[PDB]
Symmetry: D2
Subunit: 257 residues, 4 copies
């Protein structure tokens, strides 16, 4: 019968929407660290994920990505291999080890959206915009002191997050929540009448120099009270950097059995 | 911990991208019946699904839908509750009973796309356009003899299906492939190192009068040789009609155990 | 007859004229409308009326109009490509008069397709780009409303990712009385920026073959939100009146000069 | 000083002028370009040149240009809204001359945002709407190419859901020599359809502060596909030459009249 890594199945397996991992990612990031209500954050952590050594540490992350499979085939079609993303990260721990939980994410392309659910990453669809550094002319900011970079997310036609960073210095210190494993919940609805906690296994994690400065972050109404509970109490430092990793598959943290 | 019918999980369950069934659908359809190579069609049928009593009977279906949950809440936001769809149907049988297999489908909204995979319906993302009947003025066709209606699908910026119907008469005879159960394969990729054949359980199936006439259908390159194998050998009658159903959940046809 | 360079009704010019983005008029329109009548600050509305246009007989009468359209040129060629011949629109209409005759001024319009947007500027309709959603009546199933008493229909406009207008109509009854602001000539201002170091003209859109379906009428609701600036906000509803759901057709031929201010 | 009705640099007019879709120039541009030089049928190209523009010193020189831009007005206000200040573009350029001076003619352009599209017509650039994709260089990870020898960069244009141009560049070396067609004035035709029963003008875009990054150059590949008509197809490549990847900036001030054909 027909085969494939994913739907649609086909006689050769070529029609599948998704390709098997590993997948490579190369992205540009605009990120703001912030303080979240720790009691709100705790309510987004499933069993096994405990509050972070700093329970109120969170981050808002805008990124633009290119991705490809092991053969690099997608790279020659920029429309296929590019997407934009916004996500929230919360600090947590699993068996005493620091991790990050992503309670919310949005992307602007279908393949990444579905692939997110494969990994347990709770992606929905949104419109996501992000400033890009310039090196010539006057219509933008250089990656240099005083450079400003903005991000915005709209969902169903309503503007729900805006962030800004004005950088003042370069460092070699990766932002903490972007340098720990992500712990996701793998679950799909049961169509015919069992969640698993998993971590994304990565290799070849790489950061550019990190441009850091002031951060600004505002949440707006339009995603509901549960999301609103994660709005910043205080906003910290911003960071602008490039990031790469290879995603291989999942490792089980717990199946609650 | 956080809950929900689907991701993202949240403390109240309100953040979930998908709502539990049942879901109601009301749609406008432009459909063309056609002859497919039966040996090509057979290769898209998984174990348990056997060739149709007429193995070469296929259909190309364009539809525009409104949908909602049991509470009707989505109806007040037309941007949330509308989508367009194109799908291929193939005639098959399960345990001697006529059914339809959908080997390929595309939609233009994220919620329906994900919900399709919940049901085993192999939806990907596309750009889908469809003529609408008019009742005033000159810029369109009436639902009346001589009225013409067109459909088009583009995927990743390449035009891959065009269809047309010019209607000549109204009937009370629902198109055969739109009036049998759909048999889907429920399978998700395994992220941490088992397909099921299921049928969609529906109620309250309703057709408007069926406007029927000549059909035209062309496939173009741009989805690969596996899809191309289902191109029409001959094109039959076209149909333009409205359709409603309520989708409740899945029933297991086989888990291959 | 004695033409040299490339030609065309509009840019881009080409040797045959076939490449032009726009076709010459007339253009035919067939649409579905969800409209809400409302009361505007008359003094605010007046400031949007150029010289030559006087306040309407009822200076506070305004309307918010959602429509989805199919259009084509005389030859009908666009109809076979639904992606090319369809667009959604949201308009504000204000009541006014030219030399004693009732007309409507459209101070703001949005559409979701490029050809209509540019063609709007040709006619003086001040179209910008937006995301526009509108309920459609259904006739089978449960996922929507029928054109019948109790039927509800909604419209929403977002611009640059910010929700700026929402309207709703719940219809009670059918009538043969077209809504006043949808049944009078539109008076636009033709002006285009001058690139080489503008002379506006007041024009009316000349139409024929205007046609309405029966009008379904009932309660209206309308809300403006922030995100288009204070000039737009000045036209927000003081009070909201009746809503209407109907189909509309017309043929647009060209402009008739009301004043060139000579 | 003595102004009555509503005002604005462009439609829509408003009491303060704040609602206008377009801002007055100058406008600043900062972009990333993927460009392929190619050989065009010179006789085909000539038919796209209006009176006053002569064939280029090399009449068969043409280029296909993909660019992604950020832009802003003098005050920089648009930069804080990336959705408002970014757009993608695809252009064809043809070599020509005005009174002995090298210039470039743009017979066709597409963009993916409404403000740039309309602003194009203000300047005479014949912009239509399309879907435009372009590779970006990466500096970390494996999912892309570096600006370095061996780096590959692709561009694609689709119009009305049909793929019409694809280009690729694989760079070998860096130079300080800007590609010829990207380093000469653009000569456009200003014309807008007449609504009330056109006078074209040949203009050059006046720019300052033109700036290039180092130019990465290598092999070029370019393919045109059906779906924009035979007039466009006449400009398809006979031969394809070098490709170039670079960053570009300029400030656009207004038009300079080359001929009003008086
Ligand atoms: C979704 C997200 C991938 C990712 C990796 N880091 C951050 N986001 C996908 O495309 O699989
Ligand atoms: C996807 C498809 C639903 C459907 C029902 N009939 C045809 N397509 C979804 O929205 O769940
Ligand atoms: C723009 C708008 C046309 C129109 C006619 N009635 C309402 N709107 C266009 O497409 O020309
Ligand atoms: C349209 C195009 C501007 C431009 C400048 N160089 C290349 N394209 C606009 O946004 O005005």
């Amino acid at each position: 019968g027909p085969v494939g890594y994913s739907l649609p199945l086909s006689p050769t397996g070529e029609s599948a929407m998704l390709t098997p991992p590993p997948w490579h990612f190369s992205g540009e990031v605009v990120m703001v660290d912030y303080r979240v209500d720790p009691d709100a954050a705790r309510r987004f952590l499933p069993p096994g994920l405990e509050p972070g050594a700093d329970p109120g540490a969170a981050a808002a992350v805008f990124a633009t990505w290119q991705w490809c499979s092991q053969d690099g085939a997608e790279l020659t079609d920029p429309g296929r291999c590019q997407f934009g993303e916004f996500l929230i990260l919360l600090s947590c721990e699993f068996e005493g080890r620091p991790m990050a939980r992503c309670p919310y994410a949005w992307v602007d392309q279908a393949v990444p959206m579905m692939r997110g659910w494969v990994q347990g990453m709770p992606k929905q669809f949104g419109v996501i915009h992000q400033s890009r550094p310039v090196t010539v002319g006057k219509a933008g900011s250089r990656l240099a002191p005083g450079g400003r970079f903005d991000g915005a997310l709209s969902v169903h036609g309503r503007r729900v997050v805006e962030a800004s960073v004005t950088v003042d210095r370069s460092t070699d210190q990766p932002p903490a929540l972007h340098d720990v494993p992500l712990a996701h919940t793998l679950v799909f609805p049961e169509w015919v009448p069992r969640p698993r906690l998993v971590a994304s296994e990565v290799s070849d994690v790489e950061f550019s120099p990190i441009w850091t400065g002031s951060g600004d972050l505002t949440f707006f109404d339009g995603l509901g009270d549960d999301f609103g509970a994660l709005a910043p109490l205080e906003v910290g430092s911003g960071h602008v950097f490039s990031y790469g990793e290879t995603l291989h598959g999942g490792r089980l943290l717990s199946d609650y059995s």
